[PDB]
């Protein structure tokens, strides 16, 4: 076990059940996201504890599941949509169909699926799985720009794996050149409040 | 065979912890043997052709205990659609690539450190592999191959982060100015094996630096600001301090970094971008400005540094330090000289002279600061031979030193060259001027002649030049004949040449010719028993009835004592081996020179006179050849026909006080004298009897303006001469011997010495026979000190007889007295009487046929002489 992680994964059940996650208290009148940044290797360690999650925190509160490389594959098998935007020739010339089949994946309308999915304004959040699996063409930032179109006032928390510097997010090996700041920090990088686990 | 079993055992060990294991195979390595391999549950993914997303998908999602081998003929699927790529990062590969290629043509067998290489397969090729044999060292570890690594992208052949870092920096100083990116291309190749996080990293364990977003850049003003700070300005370090290295370890680095930059000019070369990055940063020297100059001999940082310090000190001498900062104008001198921007520019050390050489004009100028006193005409002779011509020397100096700052353009000092001129002008001149007046007005020498100890001119060859017979060497040797000299040459010649042997001197002195102009100079010279002035030729003049000018009349002078002259034209280096032959009788032999005087009546080079003090003076700390302890030479012989003046800005009123009654046989008139009959002094002339003073067949009195007053200004005004002070009748009877050759140099080839024969031809008659080699031009300093293969030859330097080798160490006097018999060895009658014969000199230490001068033989054999 790291129980660094397995203590900022067990703060995901205390923030849920503290004031400031459902409540939104940031500033309270916004939309109540999160952010948890995690060590990329250890995608085994925050699947395994979701899928504990979606078992355990019921107890408490109430939300559905989500896997991530599910979603993308529920709609794609291949870039897919590659394939089809290829009827774009007939309709407007080769310009539209050449810059659609290059340009893939526009991120913000990730949205309106996992509200098929999951009612979730009615939910108190939603639980997922597969985790960083997330190299297609979605980044952590842009999912918590799409979602907000769907998940109303419900907290949404970025799981990424990499880091975020509570500015700059990257994954992986080092990728992305971007941010998120409406989502409130769930556990810092940093300070023994990202360790509270001791013996 | 092997290979699969170490193929199976090498899936064995990535199975056995990882689910799934890649295999990226463009060398196809074990494209048949996929089913015969043991494997426990084990599905071969061949991923080329496969939905990328559906088989993750399969690998992730649908088959979660099922254990897969992936397979493809190249590298991963594009970044962008690499669905896999989180999986490929987290996971493993099976290496079906073999080490052992790499490892070995590394040198490094190592089967340990294999496992890193292993983490860098993507780093390799033979010419890195063996470049990076070439730097192994077998007993590596990770971090040394990192640094290696690191080193071999570097182009460097030892791996030291401060060498690297001289690499980078050079590609630094190429990014910043001329079109280059293999710094960060360099960078991104160490990134791209990890290694650049231990460039970053080992610049802390090494160099002290650090930054958390760092570049060469911010790295180069760390370290800048850490020397700029170990030199900051004592009277304003703390605000420069704040930029510096990450760590005082890193400081200290920095410094030994940066002297050896400085030290080992392989990496000077940094300094040619520091010094233009670093100003405009800050402008710190237009916030350090008043700080004190002389006590920066210590910091070399900029050009601004050294500019402040000009500044601070052309406002010390527009403040004008006559009263003088001795000491701290001192500091900063000789350590300026040796400093790094001086030692790269020349002009920078001629600002430490400019001080220096004004540091003596301005000790000296307090030292006697209205003008000068003594109770006598000998009194006041006595300090001006101790010091009272060094006011010459280092105004003239430090002017031309600050104008070799100046030498590029750099007037970045101009108008204190108007306040120390106007010392000249309207006070050193002017004041000494009034006070050996109140010597000649106390002692009226005029017609009162004798002054205490010190010789005079009037009678020379009569009375001084045979009669230097006294040792029994002697009746003879060469003169140079010159016009125009102010005494400090025949000062500074002699005294920055103490360091010279048998090169010598001694500290000597005596009075001139009273008329201080060229041609009465040489009267009292031109070799004689009496000298003669006479009518018709007026400022041209005589002795023995034979005249200072036109050259038949110049030759003949001296040949009442056998003698011949030569011309300023010609003297220079005239002719070779002939020397021998064309004067053998001539108790006297002349030479005529003449720069600073066609300076002077050229009255456009008059306000140029310190462009005498660089053209002349560039010719006058050396004049001259043919005479130390080699084929024999002697003496001095010049000395000064006059003194003069020059003056930066037209003149004071002390400059110029004027006339009485001009003579009616005015014999020269002058921009300061005029010679003619019956003159006695008056509160701005001097005036004296000639007649008494000078010898000469002459009635005359003078007419000089006495102090540094002056006359009709021919030929000259801020440049004059004619009375009778020491800028003017000074004459260097120092006890002199020979010199150090560039003036009167130019023109004829060489004359490298003379040296054969004393024989018609070089024509011999005994069965061995003289080559009876007369000493009379040696080495001195153009003319040659070369040992000589001596042998005879025909036209093409194939030899006719024996071969001799020859050198010499003497000085000696007397031309009639001079042989050397090298005794060559002769060979009957071989030589072609249709074809030229010669003596080869070699030049003996390059042994070619060198030099040769004619010869014929056909013995008549020793019989028919004895």
Known sequence: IDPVLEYRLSQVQSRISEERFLKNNGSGNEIGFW??????????????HLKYLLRNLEKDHKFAHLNIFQIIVDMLTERGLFDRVCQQEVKVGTEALKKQLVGLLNQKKIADYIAKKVDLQNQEFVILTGMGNAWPLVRGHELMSALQDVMGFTPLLMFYPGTYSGHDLSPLAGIDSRNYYRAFRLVPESGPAATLNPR | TLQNQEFIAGLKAKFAEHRIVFWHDPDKRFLEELDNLELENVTLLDMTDQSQLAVKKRIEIDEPEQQFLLWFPHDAPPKEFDWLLDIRLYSTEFHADFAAITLNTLGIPQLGLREHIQRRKAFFSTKRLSALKGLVTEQENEASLDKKMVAVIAGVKTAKTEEILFSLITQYVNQQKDDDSDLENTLAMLKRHDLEGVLWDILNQEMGYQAEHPTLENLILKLFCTDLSAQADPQKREWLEKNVLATPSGRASALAFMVTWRADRRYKEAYDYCAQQMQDALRPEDQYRLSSPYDLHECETTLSIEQTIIHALVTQLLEESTTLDREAFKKLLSERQSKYWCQTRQEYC??????????????????????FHYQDSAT???????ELFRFDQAYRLFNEYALLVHSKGAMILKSLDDYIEALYSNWYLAELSRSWNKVLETENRMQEWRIAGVPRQQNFYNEVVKPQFNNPQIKRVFVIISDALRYEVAEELGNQINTEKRFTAELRSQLGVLPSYTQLGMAALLPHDEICYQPGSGDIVYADGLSTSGTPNRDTILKKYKGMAVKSDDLLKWKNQQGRDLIRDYEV??????????????????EKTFEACRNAVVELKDLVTRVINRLHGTRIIVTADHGFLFQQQPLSGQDKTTLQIKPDNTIKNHKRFIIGHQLPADDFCWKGKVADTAGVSDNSEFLIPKGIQRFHFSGGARFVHGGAMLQEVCVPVLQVKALQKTAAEKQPQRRPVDIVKHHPLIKLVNNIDKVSLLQTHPVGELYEPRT?????????????????????DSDNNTMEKRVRDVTLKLIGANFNRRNEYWLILEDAQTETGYQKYPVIIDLAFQDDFF
């Open chain 2, 589 to 606: 032999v002349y030479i005529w020179h003449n720069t600073i005087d066609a300076m002077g009546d050229s009255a456009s080079t008059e």
């Open chain 2, 350 to 371: 001629a600002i430490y002279d400019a001080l220096r050489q004004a540091e003596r004009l301005l000790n000296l100028r307090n030292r006697h600061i209205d003008g």
């Open chain 2, 788 to 808: 000589l293969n001596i042998f005879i030859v025909d036209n093409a330097n194939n030899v006719v007889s024996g071969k001799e080798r020859i050198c010499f």
């Open chain 2, 380 to 386: 006041f002779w006595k300090a001006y031979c101790e």
């Open chain 1, 35 to 48: 952010i948890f940044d995690y060590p990329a290797q250890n995608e085994l360690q925050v699947r395994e």
